[PDB]
Amino acid sequence: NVNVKKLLESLNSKSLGDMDKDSELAATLQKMINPSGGDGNASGCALHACMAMLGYGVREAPVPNEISEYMTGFFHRHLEQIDSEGIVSHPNETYSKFRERIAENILQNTSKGSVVMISIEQATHWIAGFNDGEKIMFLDVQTGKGFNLYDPVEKSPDAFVDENSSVQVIHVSDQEFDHYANSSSWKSKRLC
After folding, report:
1. How far apart are CA 33 and CA 61, in angstroms?
2. What is the arrangement of strands in the sheet containing 136-139, beginning at the earlier edge strand?
3. Alpha carbon separation from 98 to 17, 127, 190 (Å, rounded)
4. Are strands 125-131 and 115-120 parallel, antiparallel or unpaired?
5. Contacts 24+ apart (CB under 8 A), 150-157
6. DSSP for 37-50?
7. Counting beta carbons within 10 angstroms of the beta carbon of residue 157, is it exposed (0 to 12), middle (13 to 18) or buried (19 or more)?
8. Measured in Å, how far apart are the chain's first and last C-alpha atoms?
9. Chain centre distance of CA 88
10. Which of 66, 94, 100, 104 is the most exposed place for a label (fewest CB within 10 A)?
11. Does an H or E element contain 181, and which?
12. Closest CA to 183 of 24, 71, 43
């Protein structure tokens, strides 16, 4: 049975950058959550990242033909904030800088232990985001990457971000997460 509080300790006891550390946990979690490396629709994954980070347990995300039991209608309570403009990219802003400004905005509105679902360019893609007290961990348990903006190639910390790259941080209520936890959908997903 997989213990996330265990990983996080190990991880944080290394000479790695905040992006490495994310890229690492995410690549770890991705072999369990998205073993298939399915590059389909990625809300499923993004949320299992959240479930896992809250201590609900690591489980495989829905597959394409499971998105119908639960995720088909998961965001209805949040379509306005997704459809929104969100946190927009600056010009000459690098990837690292953007990620950092996105993090400091999340830290301002969340608490240690809290997670968020992160819409990238209006649900173009989906990543998770985990508050550890001190910093945000952006995880992309689908592609096994850390922070990214769903570009077709990898980007370096010092890459320049495209102009009007946008991200909308979605604060799913704890009820929504709990609702999903007592849901046969969740329960029938493979543990670890």
Report:
1. 6
2. 87-88, 166-170, 115-120, 125-131, 136-139
3. 16, 15, 35
4. antiparallel
5. 150/120, 150/121, 150/124, 150/125, 155/95, 156/95, 157/17, 157/19, 157/94, 157/95, 157/96
6. ---S--HHHHHHHH
7. middle
8. 7
9. 18
10. 104
11. helix 174-181
12. 71
Count of positions (residues) in the chain: 192
- What the block records as the tokens of 34 is 């998205």
CA distance 12 to 21: 8
Measured CA to CA, the distance from residue 142 to residue 167 in angstroms comes to 18
Token representation of residue 42: 């990625």
Residue 158 · residue 95 · CB < 8 Å: yes
Nearest partner of 115 among 31, 49, 32, judged by Cα: 49
Around 51, how many Cα atoms within 13 Å sit in the side-chain half-sphere? Answer: 29
Phi, psi of 23 (to 5 degrees): -65, -20
Give the method of determination.
Answer: X-ray
Please check whether residue 112 is in contact with residue 125, taking contact to mean a CB–CB distance below 8 angstroms.
no
Q: Tell me how far apart the alpha carbons of residues 77 and 2 are, in angstroms, rounded to a whole number.
A: 31
Dihedral sign, Cα of residue 125, residue 130, residue 136, residue 141: negative
Give 71's DSSP letter.
Answer: G
Q: For residue 17, give the amino acid letter.
A: G
Q: Resolution for this model in angstroms, one decimal place?
A: 3.0
